[PDB]
Design a protein around this ligand. Sequence first.
Ligand SMILES: CCCCCCCCCCCCCC(=O)OC[C@H](COP(=O)(O)OCC[N+](C)(C)C)OC(=O)CCCCCCCCCCCCC
Ligand SMILES: CCCCCCCCCCCCCC(=O)OC[C@H](COP(=O)(O)OCC[N+](C)(C)C)OC(=O)CCCCCCCCCCCCC
Ligand SMILES: CCCCCCCCCCCCCC(=O)OC[C@H](COP(=O)(O)OCC[N+](C)(C)C)OC(=O)CCCCCCCCCCCCC
Ligand SMILES: CCCCCCCCCCCCCC(=O)OC[C@H](COP(=O)(O)OCC[N+](C)(C)C)OC(=O)CCCCCCCCCCCCC
Lengths: 220, 220, 220, 220
Amino acid sequence: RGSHMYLRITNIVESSFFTKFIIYLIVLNGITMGLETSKTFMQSFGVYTTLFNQIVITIFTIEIILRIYVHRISFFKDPWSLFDFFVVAISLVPFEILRVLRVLRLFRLVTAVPQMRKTVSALISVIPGMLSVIALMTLFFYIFAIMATQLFGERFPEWFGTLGESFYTLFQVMTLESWSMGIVRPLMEVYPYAWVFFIPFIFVVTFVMINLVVAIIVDA
Amino acid sequence: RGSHMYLRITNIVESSFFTKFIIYLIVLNGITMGLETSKTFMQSFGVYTTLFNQIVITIFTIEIILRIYVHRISFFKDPWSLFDFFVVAISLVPFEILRVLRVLRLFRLVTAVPQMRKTVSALISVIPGMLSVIALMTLFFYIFAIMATQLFGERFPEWFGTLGESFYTLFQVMTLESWSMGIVRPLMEVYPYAWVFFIPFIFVVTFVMINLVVAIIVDA
Amino acid sequence: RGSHMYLRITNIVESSFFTKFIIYLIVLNGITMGLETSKTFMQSFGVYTTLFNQIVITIFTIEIILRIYVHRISFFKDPWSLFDFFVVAISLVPFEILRVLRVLRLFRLVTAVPQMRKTVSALISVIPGMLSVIALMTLFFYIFAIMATQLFGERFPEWFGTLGESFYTLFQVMTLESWSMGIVRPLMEVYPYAWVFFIPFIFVVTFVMINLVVAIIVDA
Amino acid sequence: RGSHMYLRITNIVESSFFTKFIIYLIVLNGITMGLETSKTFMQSFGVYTTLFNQIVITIFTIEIILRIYVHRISFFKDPWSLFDFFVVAISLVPFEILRVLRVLRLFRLVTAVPQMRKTVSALISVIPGMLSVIALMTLFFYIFAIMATQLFGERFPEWFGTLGESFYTLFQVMTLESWSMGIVRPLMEVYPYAWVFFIPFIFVVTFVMINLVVAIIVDA
Ligand SMILES: CCCCCCCCCCCCCC(=O)OC[C@H](COP(=O)(O)OCC[N+](C)(C)C)OC(=O)CCCCCCCCCCCCC
Ligand SMILES: CCCCCCCCCCCCCC(=O)OC[C@H](COP(=O)(O)OCC[N+](C)(C)C)OC(=O)CCCCCCCCCCCCC
Ligand SMILES: CCCCCCCCCCCCCC(=O)OC[C@H](COP(=O)(O)OCC[N+](C)(C)C)OC(=O)CCCCCCCCCCCCC
Ligand SMILES: CCCCCCCCCCCCCC(=O)OC[C@H](COP(=O)(O)OCC[N+](C)(C)C)OC(=O)CCCCCCCCCCCCC
């Protein structure tokens, strides 16, 4: 708990060399994961690189293990460690989507470098003051998604045949991407007043967005 | 007016249980209205759900009735109640567009939950300081819509054949959606100087938009 | 100069009735110009409406004449009058583009209604603090327009064959409209490194835009 | 170092006539470079204009030479001169991409006119406070670019077959250009859950952008 061998390990994990080594590895596994992208490189130096990968996964597990010895329950209430935990855990399951999620370990460069932690933490910090407006927005989407599903799903199954599909399309209308040439004008060929649904939608959603952003600037 | 039975009802509508019950119903009729979206679910449990729907419509009418007993003319000068009124009234007419408008009762979650009321009320509050710029903008749209109708409606009836059609297209140009690839470049094949109409339009409309948004930030 | 008949006319133009009458006409000629949009209406009540139009043009010329008697050289240093002048002058030439420009007289509702004048004047007021950045931007466009004309005009004459054409396309890239799917990806089929031209362009132009807008907010 | 002939040259380069002459040339070589765009003009007055071009290149080399005599090592620590240096150097190599880069000398109008220098310098000044967020963003792009390359490169080689290609597409998704109609909806025909990759991408990238812009406004 504060004994002979505890304090030995503690002085290692807390050493700058520990951090730097880990950061050094992250930038290295980073570059390695970008070259693994090339089947040319993969064909030649490929096995070299599978090697470096479990090496790094092992080093990271050892590290995480140590960090829990040194920190115990303090470790499992730290966001930055919990991230490092789950990211490294993912990289330990041997469903290809998990093989790809391995790349999430590169986000450890964020947890590791305090300049980054501080940046991310600044960004995350404005989200709580947004929840109420975001709650309002989601209700809005949900309601309009229902309305659109049953107004247009039958003739327009791809875009609106399903509550989820309508959610997708409504998000696309919010981003303004092809909303008129690709969605609303087609609808109007069948539903001449469809414009009464999407223009108010676009007005509300955009007004909310601007205010949401004025919200952020309301602290500064 | 302040009698024996009046004060009895008053203590019920004003009870927290009343509010919570109503909110409870709203979240329930909400989920129900999302499952009604699926013809699978509709095929199986469908009648169960038509049931829950008039049940809720009845409960809501009773509630609204009570709330007017307790509030009388104060009720009909409250936005939040007037909304609840009109929304529930809609849900009472038996034109499919009214069947769909029933979903508007889910917005009662806004009127009911004071955190939401406050949010919405914040948003709505900035609109009056915008009316003058919005008035200016609409005049602008109207004038340019007339000009475009008669400059391009004859060769381009779909986009500009009608004052309303031109309004629609001009709105789409304002959102910047396909303005060049899908509208102005086609026009230029017939009207080489059409760019003299839409670039200034896009300049004015965008300048106004930014200032409109600086307007909001002019209080904060 | 300040005589018997001068002061008589002066009391008329300066009367509220004068202003209101003019405003009344503007809203009327406004509605009339929107109905002239319909060949149906035009077919039936059409001549009624050509009538109301020169009537109003005459009334407006008389008014402008009076206003110069009452104001003399003060009139020709007022923006709002100079506008009214040029707009009404246009409406007096009998080239269809002038027939359409007649609709610009509806902007007299702006000059006439002081709430509008004040709004417009607020908007116009931020433009001088932008000129320097706008000068920078235009130079930027000019230079990149030259570069693009000679990098891509030969294989891509429609988009870049001409300094003006390149100006048009570059403006479209700035608005982000189809910049990749419709312009840059096509170019890359011939010029694989074209992305080195348009991504920096899009970066600079967007950075400038944001700062231009922060500029406005730098007073507030 | 501060001798007879040194101080003679010094009084010339530091003269207002020197600056004005140079500026005069820049506006002239500017106009000339825009007319060189027309093969009509090129066909007729073309050689006149190749002439004016080396004339100006020579004058500029002489100038730069002088300015280094007058300034020595102070010259090579000035951004504005270093620019003028490299821009003029480019214009001295006789690979067509260098023939086009000659047009970069028009940016000397920026270095020369102090109102511009000040503007540019204002703009550049906000960039250092952005580096941390920009670092975060680039890491984000890199990681998602890797993930997309291996999730979609095989079936969608054009958009994602290569780390660079995925970088390009991800940038396009960030600008929101055709992200749904032209990229994600096509992907979903093969990968129904692709929406789980690009919506969070679009959320993060947009949130960061707004905060990056609130950053700028955080000084004002
Ligand atoms: C005030 C009220 C608050 C209510 C909050 C809770 C809402 C809960 C959502 C309800 C669940 C709806 C699920 C559902 O019906 O799924 C539909 C479809 C699959 O149905 P399926 O039977 O396969 O459709 C057949 C297709 N057809 C018609 C073309 C032949 O599959 C999908 O589309 C999947 C569903 C995706 C959408 C989920 C949206 C969650 C929104 C949360 C809003 C929170 C507001 C605060
Ligand atoms: C300073 C002046 C202020 C004036 C303010 C008041 C303006 C009032 C609007 C005038 C009414 C115009 C109605 C009208 O002409 O409707 C046209 C069309 C249907 O005409 P129709 O005869 O069916 O066209 C035949 C089609 N064709 C030529 C291709 C064979 O149907 C439509 O397009 C319907 C009309 C939709 C547009 C309504 C716009 C309202 C703008 C309000 C601006 C307020 C400014 C403060
Ligand atoms: C520091 C330097 C400052 C210099 C400022 C002054 C610049 C003055 C602009 C120079 C004039 C260029 C005019 C010109 O060459 O016009 C080209 C074309 C028509 O040429 P054309 O001979 O018909 O082309 C034949 C077509 N082809 C090759 C496909 C067979 O026709 C057009 O494209 C018309 C020209 C439109 C563009 C005008 C742009 C003005 C930019 C102002 C920038 C101010 C910066 C502060
Ligand atoms: C925390 C970790 C930090 C790591 C930072 C350092 C990252 C260094 C990047 C790694 C280098 C990757 C180069 C590479 O693999 O190039 C791939 C391709 C050409 O490969 P190739 O063998 O031709 O592909 C064959 C094509 N196929 C499969 C369809 C038959 O060619 C390309 O696509 C060229 C590569 C372009 C992308 C360069 C991106 C630099 C991102 C910098 C991020 C900084 C973060 C702070």
